[PDB]
Design an enzyme around this catalytic site. Structure first.
Site, PDB file in Angstrom:
ATOM      1  N   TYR A  83       0.838  -1.179   0.000  1.00 50.09           N
ATOM      2  CA  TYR A  83       0.000   0.000   0.000  1.00 50.09           C
ATOM      3  C   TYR A  83       0.879   1.237   0.000  1.00 50.09           C
ATOM      4  O   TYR A  83       1.603   1.481   0.950  1.00 50.09           O
ATOM      5  CB  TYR A  83      -0.981  -0.077   1.169  1.00 50.09           C
ATOM      6  CG  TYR A  83      -1.802  -1.343   1.044  1.00 50.09           C
ATOM      7  CD1 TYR A  83      -2.512  -1.608  -0.123  1.00 50.09           C
ATOM      8  CD2 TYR A  83      -1.820  -2.299   2.047  1.00 50.09           C
ATOM      9  CE1 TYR A  83      -3.228  -2.781  -0.288  1.00 50.09           C
ATOM     10  CE2 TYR A  83      -2.560  -3.468   1.903  1.00 50.09           C
ATOM     11  CZ  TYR A  83      -3.257  -3.710   0.723  1.00 50.09           C
ATOM     12  OH  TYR A  83      -3.994  -4.876   0.540  1.00 50.09           O
ATOM     13  N   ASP A 108       0.436   4.479   0.648  1.00 47.51           N
ATOM     14  CA  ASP A 108      -0.603   5.311   1.232  1.00 47.51           C
ATOM     15  C   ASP A 108      -0.578   6.734   0.646  1.00 47.51           C
ATOM     16  O   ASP A 108      -1.629   7.318   0.368  1.00 47.51           O
ATOM     17  CB  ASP A 108      -0.465   5.281   2.753  1.00 47.51           C
ATOM     18  CG  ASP A 108      -0.781   3.911   3.343  1.00 47.51           C
ATOM     19  OD1 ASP A 108      -0.251   3.573   4.431  1.00 47.51           O
ATOM     20  OD2 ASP A 108      -1.546   3.092   2.777  1.00 47.51           O
ATOM     21  N   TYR A 164      -3.200   6.375  -2.411  1.00 46.99           N
ATOM     22  CA  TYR A 164      -4.428   6.749  -1.681  1.00 46.99           C
ATOM     23  C   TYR A 164      -4.582   8.246  -1.381  1.00 46.99           C
ATOM     24  O   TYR A 164      -5.708   8.738  -1.286  1.00 46.99           O
ATOM     25  CB  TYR A 164      -4.538   5.947  -0.381  1.00 46.99           C
ATOM     26  CG  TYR A 164      -4.888   4.490  -0.600  1.00 46.99           C
ATOM     27  CD1 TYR A 164      -3.896   3.513  -0.652  1.00 46.99           C
ATOM     28  CD2 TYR A 164      -6.210   4.096  -0.802  1.00 46.99           C
ATOM     29  CE1 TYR A 164      -4.213   2.179  -0.874  1.00 46.99           C
ATOM     30  CE2 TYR A 164      -6.533   2.776  -1.023  1.00 46.99           C
ATOM     31  CZ  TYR A 164      -5.537   1.823  -1.056  1.00 46.99           C
ATOM     32  OH  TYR A 164      -5.870   0.507  -1.268  1.00 46.99           O
ATOM     33  N   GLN A 212      -5.848  13.651   1.989  1.00 46.93           N
ATOM     34  CA  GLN A 212      -7.302  13.688   1.829  1.00 46.93           C
ATOM     35  C   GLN A 212      -8.060  13.030   2.990  1.00 46.93           C
ATOM     36  O   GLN A 212      -9.226  13.365   3.241  1.00 46.93           O
ATOM     37  CB  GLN A 212      -7.712  13.146   0.456  1.00 46.93           C
ATOM     38  CG  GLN A 212      -8.260  11.777   0.380  1.00 46.93           C
ATOM     39  CD  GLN A 212      -8.616  11.400  -1.056  1.00 46.93           C
ATOM     40  OE1 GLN A 212      -7.863  10.695  -1.715  1.00 46.93           O
ATOM     41  NE2 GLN A 212      -9.750  11.873  -1.533  1.00 46.93           N
ATOM     42  N   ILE A 236      -5.952   5.492   6.878  1.00 48.92           N
ATOM     43  CA  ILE A 236      -5.975   4.765   5.609  1.00 48.92           C
ATOM     44  C   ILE A 236      -6.450   3.346   5.929  1.00 48.92           C
ATOM     45  O   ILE A 236      -5.661   2.521   6.324  1.00 48.92           O
ATOM     46  CB  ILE A 236      -4.585   4.724   4.949  1.00 48.92           C
ATOM     47  CG1 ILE A 236      -3.948   6.115   4.839  1.00 48.92           C
ATOM     48  CG2 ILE A 236      -4.691   4.068   3.577  1.00 48.92           C
ATOM     49  CD1 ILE A 236      -4.636   7.017   3.840  1.00 48.92           C
ATOM     50  N   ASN A 252      -7.353   0.373   7.841  1.00 47.23           N
ATOM     51  CA  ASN A 252      -7.028  -0.064   9.192  1.00 47.23           C
ATOM     52  C   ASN A 252      -5.959   0.785   9.882  1.00 47.23           C
ATOM     53  O   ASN A 252      -5.914   0.815  11.123  1.00 47.23           O
ATOM     54  CB  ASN A 252      -6.570  -1.537   9.186  1.00 47.23           C
ATOM     55  CG  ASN A 252      -5.394  -1.772   8.289  1.00 47.23           C
ATOM     56  OD1 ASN A 252      -5.474  -1.554   7.073  1.00 47.23           O
ATOM     57  ND2 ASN A 252      -4.268  -2.205   8.871  1.00 47.23           N
ATOM     58  N   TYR A 253      -5.084   1.413   9.094  1.00 39.53           N
ATOM     59  CA  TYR A 253      -3.939   2.166   9.631  1.00 39.53           C
ATOM     60  C   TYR A 253      -4.291   3.601   9.985  1.00 39.53           C
ATOM     61  O   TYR A 253      -5.114   4.208   9.318  1.00 39.53           O
ATOM     62  CB  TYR A 253      -2.750   2.372   8.675  1.00 39.53           C
ATOM     63  N   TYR A 273      -1.890   7.117  10.994  1.00 39.34           N
ATOM     64  CA  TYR A 273      -0.537   7.623  11.130  1.00 39.34           C
ATOM     65  C   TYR A 273      -0.561   9.087  11.498  1.00 39.34           C
ATOM     66  O   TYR A 273      -1.283   9.866  10.872  1.00 39.34           O
ATOM     67  CB  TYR A 273       0.206   7.535   9.812  1.00 39.34           C
ATOM     68  CG  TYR A 273       0.325   6.166   9.193  1.00 39.34           C
ATOM     69  CD1 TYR A 273       1.252   5.253   9.658  1.00 39.34           C
ATOM     70  CD2 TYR A 273      -0.460   5.803   8.101  1.00 39.34           C
ATOM     71  CE1 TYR A 273       1.394   4.008   9.049  1.00 39.34           C
ATOM     72  CE2 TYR A 273      -0.345   4.565   7.508  1.00 39.34           C
ATOM     73  CZ  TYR A 273       0.589   3.664   7.987  1.00 39.34           C
ATOM     74  OH  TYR A 273       0.734   2.431   7.378  1.00 39.34           O
ATOM     75  N   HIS A 290       7.712  -4.500  11.019  1.00 36.48           N
ATOM     76  CA  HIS A 290       6.683  -4.850  12.000  1.00 36.48           C
ATOM     77  C   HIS A 290       6.399  -6.350  11.955  1.00 36.48           C
ATOM     78  O   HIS A 290       5.887  -6.894  10.956  1.00 36.48           O
ATOM     79  CB  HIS A 290       5.444  -4.011  11.687  1.00 36.48           C
ATOM     80  CG  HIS A 290       4.403  -3.994  12.756  1.00 36.48           C
ATOM     81  ND1 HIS A 290       3.224  -3.274  12.610  1.00 36.48           N
ATOM     82  CD2 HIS A 290       4.348  -4.579  13.973  1.00 36.48           C
ATOM     83  CE1 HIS A 290       2.489  -3.432  13.700  1.00 36.48           C
ATOM     84  NE2 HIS A 290       3.146  -4.204  14.551  1.00 36.48           N
TER      85      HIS A 290
HETATM   86 CU   LIG Z   1       2.639  -2.270  11.082  1.00 41.92          CU
END
Ligand SMILES: [Cu+2]
Ligand SMILES: [Cu+2]
Ligand code: NA
Ligand code: NA
Lengths: 620, 620
Positions: free
Chosen positions: A288, A290, A294, A298, A371, A373-374, A376, A584
């Site tokens: 992804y 992002d 994406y 926005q 974005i 599930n995430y 930031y 991660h």
């Molecule tokens: Cu992660």
């Protein structure tokens, strides 16, 4: 009157009007990207020309366009039809996010797959996931999204707790067709809920936290003028906002005595990618971008006082375009505040009897985006002592899968039957440098160990070395933590009082870079992520390390193409691109909602000043 | 009634009385070190025995003694005469600091050297510097300090601005003799002042900082009982203080539901060394073991409210022994407070409609010490999410020299004629681990890259590997930042609900380790500093990575000697020793007083908990 002011609602409506008048924005057209362009080099002397760049999608299947508009003059500067099979698809549209689930819900293959797992189609959420570029020839030139399924037991349920593994679908979001449905076999859908506001899971909430009150009875130490020009403790900058990059800092400079000294012309996170390390065909295509695919700006959150940003907060509320060219405000989308930062400098001297202590503070400019599930947080910090720092804070809900019977080398277990595929979050900071102006160079500095012998009889000496990066072919560099490797950006024509070139030193965290095999699709599409530091010669069209159109776009653009020009970077207008990321391996503690983890970098003055710049900070 | 309570004034006066009564503390005796000993393993069941360890110096030239006293029982447990030529000299005494300058001021060689440079002896300050162990056979068994000179133009002048290079002297502080005066030639004594409170240098003080007020209208979220037992947001610990190590944390544990789960039994900075990298004979012997030679605890600052520690602060005022065994309080020597730490966790979910934000906080336990020119802040942090962190903050005035005509590979220029020799500040954190109790093991975890091929056809997979360190011979490890190397301490007999051993992961900063040639004196005396991570089997007499007596002590003791025992560390009572430091090439910005720079490490839970431990944190 600053040409670096934020876009206003009026300017966006005017871009809309100009495009309409020009025949470029009829009823089948959708704006996929819109942003103000920065002023050209040397434009300050001439009158201002506010220009906006626009990517226009066509829902009837016609080719999209890239357009530049002068809102000042009410004209179209340029308009060009894009061949997306060659140069890339436009960014994912907000309105396409629902389409994947909607199309799949009446598809007989998808329904068969759900029926095999005894799942009610009305409860199956489908994520609208970027497709990348793999082996499917039919996808070339088509806007494709891939769908992964998650069960939502009721409206307020966290669907991430209930991944439907073994199943993926591909959808053409323009022609509104399902191109493929792949079912590799049933996996148990994990049953435990992940509802972090359900008292059954949280237990009784703590009553042990007493209030912390942070106030400023006379207000903040910074001023805001022209809507987005900040002045704070000798620093000067403009806070921009772009729908792709998010918060962008312009004209970072420091007032040293009488002179306003530039440091960084433009600072942004120009790309971020989340590559996944699970070889299952259900997710092995997952990367992804992002920012590039994406558009993180926005999806910036509206930030609530005392919850997201604590203390005496000044907000900016940036305006962006919706899909039709109407302005939309992100209320309280950017937080600005100063905060205490412990001790700045301290010495208690035996011989003089003088005891001295001073406190530090930092200016903070931030936003938070979501974005899927995430979530930031992007934080820029300016410190009293001249240090500049970026920090990313990663939270949200981890992307889940089944946990295989018998374990996995590429997925960790979070709960019974619930897995979290290994992945990275890798950022690219684009730092258009201006150390005391535009004539800059970069040196790589390593610690140098010395051998015991003549000239070093006790074997204690150590030193360092600096290597100037003279051309772009020599300017793709890797970390070396063991040798304390850093990179210094200096101005060879501006010397401090000790006759040394003024400079700033970039200190990296030396986290692992992109782990994928160098022959993978992702290593080519995210080539920037394979190396820690790149230096290019500035060019107005070299904005993103991945090029302008990332969605479903192969290698061919971005940093590897820019540096092939092999331009002189030794005392020229240059740009540093720093790759940094988090690797991660999700832990049980990350479930059901992840505590923040961080990564970043900083730059510290290195002979920029003639002595400490904080001698004039007052006691108490 | 805790056996981990701080030493009281009464206990120290009682140790004095017991020693006196026993004939061990007559008028020629001086206490060089005194501290309480920790309770023995399994001592909780039996009645308490508060024991103190004492190093006794004799000013008449007799051999020093190491003595253990039971203050509870009023007895001498043990008393042994030390042979310092073998086992090391005692720590530098406070009272010896003036002696070097005093003796030199009537020495004809020293006076000749000062006269050659036209320096008034009354204005020449001499630093009392540890001697180490080099080629001077006469120093073996003698208490030596070396002196470097700095001119102080008037009483409130910063002498560090005016180093007298080319000159060093060696002094026997017991016999009160000057053994050597070395003059390699005159260098210009730099003339500019470094007086950071002189308006001529600071200029007009800033009037632009508005107040930041941090308050707690209901008080702090932590409680203090038994003088030094802290309970805060599920954490439990005792805050100790030792004159050598400074702040020491005991019994770090976390209340998970009904169970108090141990994590770390004892955490301390067990050594810190500042090796210098200038091959000039004037300084090539310079390595300051601030902890082992000088005792950082004894020079802890009294910390003033709103200046050193901001917010709602709870102070401890630790008591230490003076040179005669009388108690001396360090008023407000330890700060304790909680502070806000930004966002803890955040997710705005599209499908559920639920928006969730929670704030983080940390408990801070700190002190600040001054060792000559240097000042260091030692900070321990406990976070809501179970993370434990240490941070050192280095400030003060840089140690100076002349800057050579024609430059230097080992010294940087700060001001006209003024140099700063390159050096490192390297810490050793001793972490006596107790992950869910004492049965622990350590694994080294590396990221593992995978090749594109069968099982990984898209070349995206990545993994990790863990290697158990089974015996001490296998447990001396180096960093590998490129492969994301970390170390996990787990309990193989305590599993989480997913049937995985509970653990904590140590995340290092991967800064360079000791740079000196491996054949140098410092590489042997600070062997610990050559490697990032050591694991030993716990033993009560293995306290410091450099042994008990560091001053003028060759290799022979400390970590290399401990690990030679090759003891089982696979599911046993173990101790992790983490080396971490700053490599300092001083910058002009460090002069005339240095802005804080930092280094540290942290440990994060790794399958310790059964899910996030902060689900019960309330909104707002
Ligand atoms: Cu992660
Ligand atoms: Cu230093
Ligand atoms: Na530039
Ligand atoms: Na242990």
């Amino acid at each position: 009157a600053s040409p670096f002011r934020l876009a206003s609602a009026g300017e966006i409506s005017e871009v809309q009007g100009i495009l309409r008048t020009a025949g470029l924005l009829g009823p089948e057209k959708r704006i996929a990207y819109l942003g103000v362009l920065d002023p050209a080099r040397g434009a300050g002397s001439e009158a201002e020309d506010r220009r906006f760049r626009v990517f226009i999608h066509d829902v009837s299947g016609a080719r999209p366009q890239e357009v530049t508009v002068s809102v000042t003059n009410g004209t179209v500067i340029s308009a060009v039809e894009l061949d997306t099979a060659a140069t890339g698809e436009l960014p994912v549209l907000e309105e396409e996010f629902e389409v994947v689930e909607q199309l799949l819900a009446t598809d007989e293959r998808w329904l068969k797959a759900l029926a095999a797992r005894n799942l009610d189609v009305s409860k199956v959420r489908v994520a609208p996931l970027s497709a990348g570029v793999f082996e499917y020839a039919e996808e070339r030139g088509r806007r494709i999204l891939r769908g992964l399924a998650f069960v939502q037991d009721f409206p307020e349920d966290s669907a991430w707790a209930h991944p439907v593994d073994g199943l993926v679908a591909y959808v053409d979001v323009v022609s509104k067709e399902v191109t493929r449905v792949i079912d590799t076999g049933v996996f148990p859908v994990p049953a435990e809920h992940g509802n972090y506001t359900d008292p059954e899971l949280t237990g009784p909430l703590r009553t042990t936290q007493k209030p912390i009150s942070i106030t400023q009875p006379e207000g903040p130490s910074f001023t805001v003028t022209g809507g987005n020009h900040i002045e704070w403790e000798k620093w000067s900058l403009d806070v921009g906002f772009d729908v792709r990059e998010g918060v962008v800092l312009h004209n970072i400079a420091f007032r040293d005595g009488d002179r306003l000294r530039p440091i960084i012309n433009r600072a942004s996170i120009a790309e971020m990618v989340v590559p996944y390390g699970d070889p299952s065909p259900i997710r092995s295509w997952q990367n992804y971008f992002d920012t590039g695919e994406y558009l993180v700006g926005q999806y910036a959150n509206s930030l609530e006082l005392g919850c997201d940003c604590l203390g005496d907060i000044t907000y900016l509320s940036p305006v962006i375009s919706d899909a039709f060219g109407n302005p939309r405000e992100i209320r309280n989308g950017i937080c600005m505040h100063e905060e205490d930062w412990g001790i700045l400098a301290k010495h208690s001297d035996l011989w003089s009897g003088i005891n001295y202590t001073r406190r530090n503070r930092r200016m903070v400019i931030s936003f938070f985006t979501t974005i899927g599930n995430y979530d930031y947080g992007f934080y820029w910090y300016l410190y009293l002592d001249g240090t500049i720092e970026f920090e990313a804070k990663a939270t949200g809900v981890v992307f889940t899968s089944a946990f295989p019977e018998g374990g996995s080398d590429n997925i960790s277990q979070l709960a019974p039957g619930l897995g979290a595929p290994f992945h990275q979050h890798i950022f690219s900071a684009r730092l258009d440098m201006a150390i005391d102006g535009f004539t800059n160079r970069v040196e790589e500095e390593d610690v140098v160990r010395q051998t015991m012998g003549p000239g070093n009889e006790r074997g204690n000496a150590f030193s360092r070395k600096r290597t100037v990066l003279t051309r772009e072919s020599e300017a793709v560099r890797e970390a070396d933590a063991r040798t304390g490797r850093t990179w210094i950006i200096s101005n060879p024509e501006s010397k401090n009082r000790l006759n040394e070139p003024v400079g700033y030193k970039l200190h990296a965290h030396n986290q692992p870079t992109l782990l994928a095999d160098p022959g993978s699709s992702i290593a080519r599409r995210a080539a920037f992520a394979t190396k820690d530091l790149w230096v290019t010669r500035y060019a107005d069209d070299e904005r993103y390390p991945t090029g302008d159109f990332v969605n479903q776009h192969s290698g061919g653009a971005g940093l590897p193409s820019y540096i092939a020009q092999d331009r002189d970077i030794d005392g020229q207008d240059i740009v540093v691109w720093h790759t940094f990321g988090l690797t991660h391996f999700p832990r049980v503690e990350d479930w059901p909602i992840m505590p923040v983890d961080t990564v970043g970098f900083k730059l510290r003055p290195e002979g920029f000043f003639d002595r400490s710049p904080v001698l004039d900070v007052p006691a108490n």
